[PDB]
């Protein structure tokens, strides 16, 4: 499906339907400040096409939303290319949220998780975040219903050791947390435990095929997951390969070429040669 740009949804649900035909959000997704929404507004609402967000996901003050299991059932990767103060996932002051329910979330490349001040929030102790983030050291999961000890969490599920005890791994009463053998690393596996291709990230429709990945570990090009963009293509938004012409079209209303990447701006020590979008180093101090 489509690549949609970063979104910022506030006040009304109307604008949320802009996500309807979408596979990747190239940017962040913020859903916030919905004070008059009620559970009935979310009973019939789903975006099953969404597989990946390149930056971060932020949910703040969205009233009436009880679970995300119907909203983002297939969200598999949050890349964390840009973060919200070190976080790739932010659940803050989500009054009414009873569970996360992101049962397809396999990997958070880059950042950490901040789930704070969610009265009603359970199904947190049941999640093994070490399967999703390399660093759980910087997670900040506090002041939720889960803190009190009396979340009647009820889950078959692959219990793992977090403290000194094995604890069940599930997202909701009807969804276990997927765990792949350690040998699969982050590539994901099939229901039968067979590793996905090494260029996949999190999940695949078939094993050992880089055109059958749910998401890419490295970069995406012409239906396929690739280790690097080959010439003449450029690395874009740290997830896809684009041609010069694409980067140029962006620039012309402000993107530049540097080290085989199409990037927002020239890095320090460089200025932009105008005729070919190319960052060239500075003869003496840089323009200012």
């Amino acid at each position, epitope marked *: 499906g489509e690549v949609c740009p970063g979104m910022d949804i506030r006040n009304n649900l109307t604008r949320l339907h802009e996500l309807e035909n979408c596979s990747v959000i190239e940017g962040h997704l913020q859903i916030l400040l919905m004070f008059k929404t009620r559970p009935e507004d979310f009973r019939d609402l789903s975006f099953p096409k969404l597989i990946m967000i390149t930056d971060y996901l932020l949910l703040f003050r969205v009233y009436g939303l009880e679970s995300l299991k119907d909203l983002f059932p297939n969200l598999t990767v949050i890349r964390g290319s840009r973060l919200f103060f070190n976080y790739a996932l932010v659940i803050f002051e989500m009054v009414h949220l009873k569970e996360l329910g992101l049962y397809n979330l396999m990997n958070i490349t880059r950042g950490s998780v901040r789930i704070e001040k969610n009265n009603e929030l359970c199904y947190l102790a049941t999640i093994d975040w070490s399967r999703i983030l390399d660093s759980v050291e910087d997670n900040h999961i506090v002041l939720n219903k889960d803190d009190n000890e009396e979340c009647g969490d009820i889950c078959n599920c692959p219990a793992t050791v977090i403290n000194g005890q094995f604890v069940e791994r599930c997202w909701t009463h009807s969804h276990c947390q997927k765990v792949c053998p350690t040998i699969c690393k982050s590539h994901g596996c099939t229901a039968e435990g067979l590793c996905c291709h090494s*260029e996949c990230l999190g999940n695949c429709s078939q094993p050992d095929d*880089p*055109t059958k990945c749910v998401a890419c570990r490295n970069f995406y*090009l*012409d239906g396929r997951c*690739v*280790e690097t963009c*080959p*010439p003449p293509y450029y690395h874009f938004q740290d997830w896809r390969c684009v041609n010069f012409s694409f980067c140029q079209d962006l620039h012309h209303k402000q993107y530049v070429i540097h080290n085989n990447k199409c990037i927002p701006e020239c890095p320090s020590g460089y200025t932009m040669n105008s005729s070919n979008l190319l960052c060239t180093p500075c003869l003496g101090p840089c323009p200012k």
Partner: antibody, heavy 118, light 113 residues
Framework: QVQLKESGPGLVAPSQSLSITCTVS????????VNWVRQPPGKGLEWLGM???????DYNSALKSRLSISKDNSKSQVFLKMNSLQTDDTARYYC????????????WGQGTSVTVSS | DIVMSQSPSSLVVSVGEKVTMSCKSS????????????LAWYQQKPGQSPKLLIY???TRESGVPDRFTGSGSGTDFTLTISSVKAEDLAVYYC????????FGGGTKLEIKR
């Protein structure tokens, strides 16, 4: 189950064109490139050109762009056409897959022998 | 257009010995964005189709004996066979896939007995 096979004419009269169809299976031409390489009897390999997933092509300038590479994604076929062959174009012609951003030419066809003579 | 040149054109070695052959490119094949060399080595046993052995100048293809080792960076490259076996007899080629794709002239390996 990656496979590639060339269907050539075997013989080409001097000044005539060479047409070869490479039929592939086990992968989609939309996600992989296909190259053509030739080997004169008892000599080395010469890279001729390739067709990327998007249909864009790269040709070896030594061929004096006598070469055309096209394809039909739905029929898993890649077409080589070369204008006005001469005796020195006598060689075994191979179509080889290349998984561009990840690997170099993985999976070669058995090749088809081409003789230019009357 | 990148030009590739290999040496020796040929050599002979007996079973068990180590062998090294070189490849040269008129332009650097070292990709900025990842610090990888866009060079490959192919082995062609006589009468057979060529086989990919090494890519990225040093990455060994799966199902390739540890005997084959690729070295070099930028414009100068080498292929090494760490204990030649009877069936290692073949022509070795290097290919650049940085800009377009071009093959070297190849090196022929014969076996002494």
């Amino acid at each position: 189950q990656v496979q590639l096979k060339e269907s050539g004419p075997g013989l080409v009269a001097p000044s005539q064109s060479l047409s070869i169809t490479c039929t592939v299976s086990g992968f989609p031409l939309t996600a992989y490139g296909v190259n053509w390489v030739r080997q004169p009897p008892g000599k080395g390999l010469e890279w001729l050109g390739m067709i990327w997933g998007d249909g864009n092509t790269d040709y070896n300038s030594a061929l004096k762009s006598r070469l055309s590479i096209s394809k039909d994604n739905s029929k898993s076929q890649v077409f080589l056409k070369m204008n006005s062959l001469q005796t020195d174009d006598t060689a075994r012609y191979y179509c080889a897959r290349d998984p561009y951003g990840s690997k170099p030419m993985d999976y070669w066809g058995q090749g088809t022998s081409v003789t230019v003579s009357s | 257009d990148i030009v590739m040149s290999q040496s020796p054109s040929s050599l002979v070695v007996s079973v068990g010995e180590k062998v090294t052959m070189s490849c040269k490119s008129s332009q650097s094949l070292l990709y900025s964005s990842n610090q990888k060399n866009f060079l490959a080595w192919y082995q062609q046993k006589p009468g057979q189709s060529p086989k990919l052995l090494i890519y990225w100048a040093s990455t060994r293809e799966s199902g390739v004996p540890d005997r084959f080792t690729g070295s070099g960076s930028g414009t100068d490259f080498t292929l090494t066979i760490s204990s030649v076996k009877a069936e290692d007899l073949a022509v070795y080629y290097c290919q650049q896939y940085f800009r377009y794709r071009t093959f070297g002239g190849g090196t022929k390996l014969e076996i002494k007995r």
